[PDB]
Short mmCIF file of C-alpha atoms and ligand atoms in Angstrom, two decimals:
data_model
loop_
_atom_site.label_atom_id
_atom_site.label_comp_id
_atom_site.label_asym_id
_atom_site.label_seq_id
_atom_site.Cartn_x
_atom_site.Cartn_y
_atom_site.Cartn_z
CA UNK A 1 13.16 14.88 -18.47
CA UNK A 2 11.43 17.63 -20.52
CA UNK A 3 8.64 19.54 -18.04
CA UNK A 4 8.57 22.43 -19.87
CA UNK A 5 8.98 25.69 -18.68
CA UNK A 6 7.36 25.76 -14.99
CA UNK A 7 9.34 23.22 -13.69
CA UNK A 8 13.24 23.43 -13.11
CA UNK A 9 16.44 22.83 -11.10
CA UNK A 10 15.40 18.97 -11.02
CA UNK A 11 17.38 16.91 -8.66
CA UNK A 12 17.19 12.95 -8.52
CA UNK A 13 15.59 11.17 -5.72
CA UNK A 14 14.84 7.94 -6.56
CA UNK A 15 14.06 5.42 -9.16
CA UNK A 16 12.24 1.61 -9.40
CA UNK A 17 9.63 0.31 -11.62
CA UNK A 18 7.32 3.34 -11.39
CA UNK A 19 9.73 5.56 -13.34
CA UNK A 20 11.93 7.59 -11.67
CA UNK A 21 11.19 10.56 -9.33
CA UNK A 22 13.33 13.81 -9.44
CA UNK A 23 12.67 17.51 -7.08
CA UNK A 24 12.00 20.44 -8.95
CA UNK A 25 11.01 23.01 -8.53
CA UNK A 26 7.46 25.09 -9.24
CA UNK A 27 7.75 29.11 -10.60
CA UNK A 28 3.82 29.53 -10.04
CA UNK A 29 3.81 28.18 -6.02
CA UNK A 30 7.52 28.64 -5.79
CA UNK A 31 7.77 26.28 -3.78
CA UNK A 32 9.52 22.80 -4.84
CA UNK A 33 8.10 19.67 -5.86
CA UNK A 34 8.44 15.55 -6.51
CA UNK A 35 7.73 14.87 -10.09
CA UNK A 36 8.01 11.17 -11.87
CA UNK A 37 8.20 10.70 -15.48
CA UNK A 38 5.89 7.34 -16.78
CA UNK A 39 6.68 5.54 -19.97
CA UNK A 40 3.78 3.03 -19.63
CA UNK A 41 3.09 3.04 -23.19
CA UNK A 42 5.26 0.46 -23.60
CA UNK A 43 3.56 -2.68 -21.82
CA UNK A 44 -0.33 -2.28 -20.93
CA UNK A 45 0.40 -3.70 -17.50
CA UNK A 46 2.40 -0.30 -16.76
CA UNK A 47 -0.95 1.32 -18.49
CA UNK A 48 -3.64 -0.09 -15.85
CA UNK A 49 -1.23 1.06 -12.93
CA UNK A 50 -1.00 4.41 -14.33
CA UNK A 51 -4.60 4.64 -15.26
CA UNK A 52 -5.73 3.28 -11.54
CA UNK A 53 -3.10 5.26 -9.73
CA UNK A 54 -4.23 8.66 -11.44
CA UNK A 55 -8.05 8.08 -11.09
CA UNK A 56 -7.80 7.27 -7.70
CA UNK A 57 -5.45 9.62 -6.53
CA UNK A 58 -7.28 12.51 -8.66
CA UNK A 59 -10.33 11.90 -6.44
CA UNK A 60 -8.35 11.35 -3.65
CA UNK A 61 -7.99 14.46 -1.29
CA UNK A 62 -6.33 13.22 2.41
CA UNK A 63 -3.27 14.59 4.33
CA UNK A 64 -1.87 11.03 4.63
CA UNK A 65 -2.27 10.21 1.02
CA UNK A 66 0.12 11.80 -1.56
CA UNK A 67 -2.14 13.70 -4.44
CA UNK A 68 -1.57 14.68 -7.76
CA UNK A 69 -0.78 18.67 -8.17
CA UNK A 70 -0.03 18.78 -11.98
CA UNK A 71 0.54 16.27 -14.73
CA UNK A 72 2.73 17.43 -17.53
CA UNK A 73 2.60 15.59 -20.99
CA UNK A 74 2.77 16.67 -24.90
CA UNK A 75 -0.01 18.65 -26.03
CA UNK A 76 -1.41 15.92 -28.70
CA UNK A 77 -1.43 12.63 -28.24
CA UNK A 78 0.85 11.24 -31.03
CA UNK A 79 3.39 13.54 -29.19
CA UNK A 80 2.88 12.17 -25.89
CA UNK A 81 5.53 9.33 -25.19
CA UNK A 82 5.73 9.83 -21.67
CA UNK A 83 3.65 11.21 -18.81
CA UNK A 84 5.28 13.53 -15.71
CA UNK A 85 3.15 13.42 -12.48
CA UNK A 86 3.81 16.14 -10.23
CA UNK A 87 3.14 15.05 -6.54
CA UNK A 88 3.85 16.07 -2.46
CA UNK A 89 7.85 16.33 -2.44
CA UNK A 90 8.65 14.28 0.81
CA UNK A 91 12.41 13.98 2.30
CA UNK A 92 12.29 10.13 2.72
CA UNK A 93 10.25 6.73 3.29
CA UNK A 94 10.02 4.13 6.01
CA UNK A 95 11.93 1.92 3.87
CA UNK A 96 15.16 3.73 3.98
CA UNK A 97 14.28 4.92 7.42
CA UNK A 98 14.52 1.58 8.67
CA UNK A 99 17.69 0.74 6.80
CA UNK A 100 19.65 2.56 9.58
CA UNK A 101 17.43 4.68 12.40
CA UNK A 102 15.90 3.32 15.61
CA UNK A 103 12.22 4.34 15.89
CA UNK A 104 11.11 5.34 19.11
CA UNK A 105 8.15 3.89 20.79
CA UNK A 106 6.85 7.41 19.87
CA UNK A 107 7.87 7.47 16.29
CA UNK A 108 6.52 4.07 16.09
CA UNK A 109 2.95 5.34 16.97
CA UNK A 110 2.93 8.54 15.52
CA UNK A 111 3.43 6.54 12.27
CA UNK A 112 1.06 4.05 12.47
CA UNK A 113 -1.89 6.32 13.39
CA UNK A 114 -1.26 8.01 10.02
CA UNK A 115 -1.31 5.01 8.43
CA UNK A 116 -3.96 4.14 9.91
CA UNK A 117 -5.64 7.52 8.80
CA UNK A 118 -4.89 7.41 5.51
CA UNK A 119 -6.07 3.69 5.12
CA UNK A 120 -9.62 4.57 6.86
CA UNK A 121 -9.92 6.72 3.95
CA UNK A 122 -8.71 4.50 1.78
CA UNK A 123 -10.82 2.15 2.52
CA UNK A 124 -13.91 4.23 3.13
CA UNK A 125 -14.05 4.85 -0.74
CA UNK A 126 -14.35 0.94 -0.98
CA UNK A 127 -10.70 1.03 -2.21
CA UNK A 128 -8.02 -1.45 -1.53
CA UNK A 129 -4.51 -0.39 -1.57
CA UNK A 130 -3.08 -3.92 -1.74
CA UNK A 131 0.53 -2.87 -1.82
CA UNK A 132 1.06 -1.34 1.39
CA UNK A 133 5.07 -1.70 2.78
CA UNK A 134 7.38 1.17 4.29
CA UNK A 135 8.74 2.00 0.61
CA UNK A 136 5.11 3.38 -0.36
CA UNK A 137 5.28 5.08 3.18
CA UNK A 138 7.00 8.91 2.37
CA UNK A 139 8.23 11.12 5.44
CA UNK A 140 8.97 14.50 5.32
CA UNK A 141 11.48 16.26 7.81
CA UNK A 142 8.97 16.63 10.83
CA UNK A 143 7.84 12.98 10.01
CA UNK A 144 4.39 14.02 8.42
CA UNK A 145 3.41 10.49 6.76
CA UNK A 146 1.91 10.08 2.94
CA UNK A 147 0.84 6.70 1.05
CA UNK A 148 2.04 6.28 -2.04
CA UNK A 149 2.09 3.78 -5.30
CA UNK A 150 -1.70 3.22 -6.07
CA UNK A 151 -0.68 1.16 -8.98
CA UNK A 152 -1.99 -1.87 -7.33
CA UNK A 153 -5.29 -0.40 -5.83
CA UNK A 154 -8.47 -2.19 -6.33
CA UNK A 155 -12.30 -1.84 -5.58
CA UNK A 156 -13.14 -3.80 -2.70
CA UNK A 157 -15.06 -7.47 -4.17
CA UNK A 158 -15.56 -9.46 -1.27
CA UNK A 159 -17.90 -11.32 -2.73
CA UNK A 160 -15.67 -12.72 -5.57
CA UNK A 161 -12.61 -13.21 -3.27
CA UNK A 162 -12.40 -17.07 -3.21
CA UNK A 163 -10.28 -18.73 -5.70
CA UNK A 164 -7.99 -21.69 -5.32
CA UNK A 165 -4.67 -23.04 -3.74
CA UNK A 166 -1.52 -21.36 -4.86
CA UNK A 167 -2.94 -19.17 -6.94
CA UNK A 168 -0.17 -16.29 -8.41
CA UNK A 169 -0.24 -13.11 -6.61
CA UNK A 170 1.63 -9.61 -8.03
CA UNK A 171 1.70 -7.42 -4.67
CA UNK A 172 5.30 -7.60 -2.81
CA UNK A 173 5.83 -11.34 -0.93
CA UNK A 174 6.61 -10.25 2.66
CA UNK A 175 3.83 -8.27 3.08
CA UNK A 176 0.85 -10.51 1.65
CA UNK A 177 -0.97 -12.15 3.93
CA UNK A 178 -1.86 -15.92 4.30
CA UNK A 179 -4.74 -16.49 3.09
CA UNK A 180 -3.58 -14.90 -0.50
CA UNK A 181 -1.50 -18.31 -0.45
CA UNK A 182 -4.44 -20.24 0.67
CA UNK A 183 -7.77 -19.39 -1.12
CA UNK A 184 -7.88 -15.28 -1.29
CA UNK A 185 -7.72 -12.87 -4.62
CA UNK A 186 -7.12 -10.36 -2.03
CA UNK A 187 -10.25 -8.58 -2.95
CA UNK A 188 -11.31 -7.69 0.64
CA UNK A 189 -10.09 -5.08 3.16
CA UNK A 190 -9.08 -7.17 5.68
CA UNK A 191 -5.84 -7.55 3.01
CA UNK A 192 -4.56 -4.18 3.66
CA UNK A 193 -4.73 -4.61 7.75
CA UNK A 194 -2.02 -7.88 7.18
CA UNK A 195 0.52 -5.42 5.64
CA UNK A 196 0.37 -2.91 8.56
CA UNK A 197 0.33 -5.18 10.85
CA UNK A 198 3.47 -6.90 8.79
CA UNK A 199 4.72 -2.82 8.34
CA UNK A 200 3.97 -2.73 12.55
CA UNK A 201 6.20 -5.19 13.15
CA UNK A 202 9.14 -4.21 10.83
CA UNK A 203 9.10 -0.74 13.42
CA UNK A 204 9.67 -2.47 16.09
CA UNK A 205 12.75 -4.68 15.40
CA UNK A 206 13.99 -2.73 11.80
CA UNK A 207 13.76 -5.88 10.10
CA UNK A 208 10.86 -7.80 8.12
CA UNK A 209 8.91 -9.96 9.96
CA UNK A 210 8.13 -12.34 7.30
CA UNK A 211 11.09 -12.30 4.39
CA UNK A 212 9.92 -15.02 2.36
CA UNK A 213 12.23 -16.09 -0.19
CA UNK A 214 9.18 -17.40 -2.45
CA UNK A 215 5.62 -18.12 -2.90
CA UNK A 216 5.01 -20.26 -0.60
CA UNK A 217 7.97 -19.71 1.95
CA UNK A 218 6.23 -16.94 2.49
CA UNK A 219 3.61 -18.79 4.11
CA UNK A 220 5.81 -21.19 6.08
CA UNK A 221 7.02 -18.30 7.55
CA UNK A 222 4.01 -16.51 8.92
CA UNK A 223 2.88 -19.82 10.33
CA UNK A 224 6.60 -19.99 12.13
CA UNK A 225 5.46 -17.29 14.02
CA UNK A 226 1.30 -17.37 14.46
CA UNK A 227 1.52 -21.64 14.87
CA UNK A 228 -0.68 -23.43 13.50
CA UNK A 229 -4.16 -22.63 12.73
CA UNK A 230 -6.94 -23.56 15.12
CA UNK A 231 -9.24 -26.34 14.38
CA UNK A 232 -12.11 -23.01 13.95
CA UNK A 233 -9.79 -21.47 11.47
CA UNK A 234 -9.16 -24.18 9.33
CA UNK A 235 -12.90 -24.79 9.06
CA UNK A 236 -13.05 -21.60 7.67
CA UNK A 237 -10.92 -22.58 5.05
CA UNK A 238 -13.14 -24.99 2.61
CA UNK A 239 -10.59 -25.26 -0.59
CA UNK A 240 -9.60 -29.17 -0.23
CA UNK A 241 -6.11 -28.58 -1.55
CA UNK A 242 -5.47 -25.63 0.52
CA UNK A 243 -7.05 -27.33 3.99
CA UNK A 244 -5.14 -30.45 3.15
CA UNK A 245 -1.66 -28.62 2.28
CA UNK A 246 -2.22 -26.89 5.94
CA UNK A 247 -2.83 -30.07 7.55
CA UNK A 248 0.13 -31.89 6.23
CA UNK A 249 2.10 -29.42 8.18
CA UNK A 250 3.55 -30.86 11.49
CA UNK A 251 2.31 -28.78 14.72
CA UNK A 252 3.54 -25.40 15.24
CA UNK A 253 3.76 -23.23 18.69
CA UNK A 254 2.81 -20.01 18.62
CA UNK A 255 5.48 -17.10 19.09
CA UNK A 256 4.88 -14.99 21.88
CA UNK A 257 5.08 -11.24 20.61
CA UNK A 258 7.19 -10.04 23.55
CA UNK A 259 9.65 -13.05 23.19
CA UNK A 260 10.19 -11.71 19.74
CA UNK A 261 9.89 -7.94 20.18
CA UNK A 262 10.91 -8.20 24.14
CA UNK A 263 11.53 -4.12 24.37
CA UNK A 264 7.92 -3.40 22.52
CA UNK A 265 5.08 -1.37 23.82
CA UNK A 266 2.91 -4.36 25.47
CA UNK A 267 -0.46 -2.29 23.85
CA UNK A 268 1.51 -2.34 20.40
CA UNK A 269 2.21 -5.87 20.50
CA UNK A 270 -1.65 -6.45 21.25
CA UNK A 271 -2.69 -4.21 18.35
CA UNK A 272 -0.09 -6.29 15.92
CA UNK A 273 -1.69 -9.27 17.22
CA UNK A 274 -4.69 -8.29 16.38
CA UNK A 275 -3.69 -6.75 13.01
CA UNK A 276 -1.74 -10.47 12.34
CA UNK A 277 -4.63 -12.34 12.87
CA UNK A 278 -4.51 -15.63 10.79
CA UNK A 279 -8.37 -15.50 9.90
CA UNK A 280 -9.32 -12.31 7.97
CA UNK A 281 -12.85 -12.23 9.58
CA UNK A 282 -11.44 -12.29 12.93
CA UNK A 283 -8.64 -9.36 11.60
CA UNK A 284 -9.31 -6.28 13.40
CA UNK A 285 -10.32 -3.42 10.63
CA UNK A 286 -9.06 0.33 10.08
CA UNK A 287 -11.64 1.97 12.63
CA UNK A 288 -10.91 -0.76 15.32
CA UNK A 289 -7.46 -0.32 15.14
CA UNK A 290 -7.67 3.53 15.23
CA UNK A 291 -9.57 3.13 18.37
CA UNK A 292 -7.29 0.89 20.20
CA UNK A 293 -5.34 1.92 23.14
CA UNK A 294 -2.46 2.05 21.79
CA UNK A 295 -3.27 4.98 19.26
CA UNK A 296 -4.65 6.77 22.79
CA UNK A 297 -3.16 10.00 22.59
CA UNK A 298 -3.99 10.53 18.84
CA UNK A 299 -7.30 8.96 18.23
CA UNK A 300 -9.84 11.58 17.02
CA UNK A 301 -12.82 10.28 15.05
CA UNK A 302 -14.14 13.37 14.23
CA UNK A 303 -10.52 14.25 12.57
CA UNK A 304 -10.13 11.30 10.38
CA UNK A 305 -11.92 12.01 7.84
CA UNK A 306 -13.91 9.72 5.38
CA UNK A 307 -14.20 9.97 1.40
CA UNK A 308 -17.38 11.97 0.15
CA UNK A 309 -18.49 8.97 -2.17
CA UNK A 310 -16.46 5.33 -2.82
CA UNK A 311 -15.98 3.74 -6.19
CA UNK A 312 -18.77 2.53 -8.20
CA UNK A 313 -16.77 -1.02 -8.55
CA UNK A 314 -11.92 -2.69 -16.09
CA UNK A 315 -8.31 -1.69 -16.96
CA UNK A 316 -8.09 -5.40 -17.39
CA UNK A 317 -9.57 -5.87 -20.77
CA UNK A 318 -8.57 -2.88 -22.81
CA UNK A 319 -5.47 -2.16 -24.82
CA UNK A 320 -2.23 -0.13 -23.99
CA UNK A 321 -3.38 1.81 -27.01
CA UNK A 322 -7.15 2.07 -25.45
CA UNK A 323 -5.92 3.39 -22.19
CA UNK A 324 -3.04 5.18 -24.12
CA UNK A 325 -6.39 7.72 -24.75
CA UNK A 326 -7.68 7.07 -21.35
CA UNK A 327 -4.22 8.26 -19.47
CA UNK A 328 -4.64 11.29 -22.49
CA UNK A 329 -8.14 12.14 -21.20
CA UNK A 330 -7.55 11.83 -17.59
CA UNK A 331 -4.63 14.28 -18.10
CA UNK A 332 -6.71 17.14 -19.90
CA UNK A 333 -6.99 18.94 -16.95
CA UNK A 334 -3.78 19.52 -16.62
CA UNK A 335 -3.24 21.39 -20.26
CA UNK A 336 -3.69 24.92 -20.99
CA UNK A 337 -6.93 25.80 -22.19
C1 19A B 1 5.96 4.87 -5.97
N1 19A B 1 6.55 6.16 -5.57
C2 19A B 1 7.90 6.13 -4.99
C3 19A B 1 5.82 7.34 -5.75
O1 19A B 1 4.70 7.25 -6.25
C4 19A B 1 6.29 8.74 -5.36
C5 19A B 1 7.28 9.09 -4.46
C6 19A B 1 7.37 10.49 -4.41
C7 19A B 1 8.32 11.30 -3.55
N2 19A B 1 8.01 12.49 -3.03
N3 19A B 1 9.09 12.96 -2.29
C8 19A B 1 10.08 12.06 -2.34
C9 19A B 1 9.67 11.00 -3.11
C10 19A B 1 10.51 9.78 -3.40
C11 19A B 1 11.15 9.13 -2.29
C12 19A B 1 11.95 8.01 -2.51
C13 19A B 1 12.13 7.50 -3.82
C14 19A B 1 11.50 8.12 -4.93
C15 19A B 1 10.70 9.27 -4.72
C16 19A B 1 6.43 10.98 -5.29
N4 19A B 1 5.78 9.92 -5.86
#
């Protein structure tokens, strides 16, 4: 956990697939800081998240998106085996939040209009997040909210978002939404809007609202809970396989929200209705959602601020070792001299 000499007195805070993330703290700012160490140069799947997560979050500048302060790695490139990224140091996230505090109905708003914020941003650089869930969601100690993990992030493609039935997904199950399942590369905003609606929901009741045990369980139980889909929304739907599969299905009620979150804010439950929305044209988007009345007392156009310029529109098709120089050259700034 070498960070040479500006960073000490590390102290663990959590680890997972992304490396692990330790405090520390910073001699220039004094002040102390959340750094995780990345050995992606071992798979080039670990590569392309690093590689999107830095490039995005480099040209990211938002107070509900975590940045990138410093990134410390060796000075050549035959010595760099791992790569430190030094980001907002943040007391907690939603997901052990949840684990064991009741939100209030204030809590539970004050959250989701930064979420909200930060994905109008987001989303406003034609950027998909596409692994939004309350473990990406940081807190600090007067519950100031940050996104994290842009390992996952795309460019919005909604023009090459059709693909067939079943086809295998990577972002976490209980938070995808249906139509990923159904006929979706998840290529389009409307993707994002599913997981805070599914992240809404989770507030309200501390528990997921759809814990699929697989793929497609994970459908069965969204549709548990919507019913089935209207005769206009299966239309919509023209994969055969997929249409047929959702057909097959014997007839499902709808859920009532306030049967299933009965002490809920009745203008949340109308704003997660409207964020669960089976048909992702009909899915209410960031700017709607900011302006509904349940985010009253915070919503503020003029203070939500927009990117200056989006992405342009691969990581893909490029070796570990190709990006190995990539990661190298997006981290010169960092280096003295
Ligand atoms: C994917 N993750 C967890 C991140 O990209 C991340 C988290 C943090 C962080 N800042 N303050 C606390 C944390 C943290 C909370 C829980 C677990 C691990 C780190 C910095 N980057």
């Amino acid at each position: 956990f070498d960070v040479g000499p500006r960073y000490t007195n590390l102290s663990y805070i959590g680890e997972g697939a992304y490396g692990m993330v330790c405090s520390a703290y910073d001699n220039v700012n004094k002040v102390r800081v959340a750094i995780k160490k990345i050995s992606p140069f071992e798979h080039q799947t670990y590569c392309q998240r690093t590689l999107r997560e830095i490039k995005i979050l480099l040209r990211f500048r938002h107070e509900n998106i975590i940045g990138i302060n410093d990134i410390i790695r060796a000075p050549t490139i035959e010595q760099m085996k791992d790569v430190y990224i030094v980001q907002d140091l943040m007391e907690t996230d939603l997901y052990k939040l949840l684990k064991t505090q009741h939100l209030s109905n204030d809590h539970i708003c004050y959250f989701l209009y930064q979420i909200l914020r930060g994905l109008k941003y987001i989303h406003s650089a034609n950027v998909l997040h596409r692994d939004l869930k309350p473990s990406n969601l940081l807190l600090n100690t007067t519950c100031d909210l940050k996104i994290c993990d842009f390992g996952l992030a795309r460019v919005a493609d909604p023009d090459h978002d059709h693909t067939g039935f079943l086809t295998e997904y990577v972002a976490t199950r209980w938070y995808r939404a249906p139509e990923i399942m159904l006929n979706s590369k998840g290529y389009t905003k409307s993707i994002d809007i599913w997981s805070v609606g599914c992240i809404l929901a989770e507030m309200l009741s501390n528990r997921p609202i759809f814990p699929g045990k697989h793929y497609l369980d994970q459908l069965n139980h969204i549709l548990g809970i919507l019913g089935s889909p209207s005769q206009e929304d299966l239309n919509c739907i023209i994969n055969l396989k997929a249409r047929n599969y959702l057909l097959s299905l014997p007839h499902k009620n709808k859920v009532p929200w306030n049967r299933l979150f009965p002490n809920a804010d009745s203008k949340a439950l109308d704003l997660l209705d409207k964020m669960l929305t089976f048909n992702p044209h009909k899915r209410i988007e960031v700017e709607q959602a900011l302006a509904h009345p349940y985010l009253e007392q915070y919503y503020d156009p003029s203070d939500e601020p927009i990117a200056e310029a989006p992405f342009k529109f691969e990581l893909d098709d490029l070796p570990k070792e190709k990006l190995k120089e990539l990661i190298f050259e997006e981290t010169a700034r960092f280096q003295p001299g």
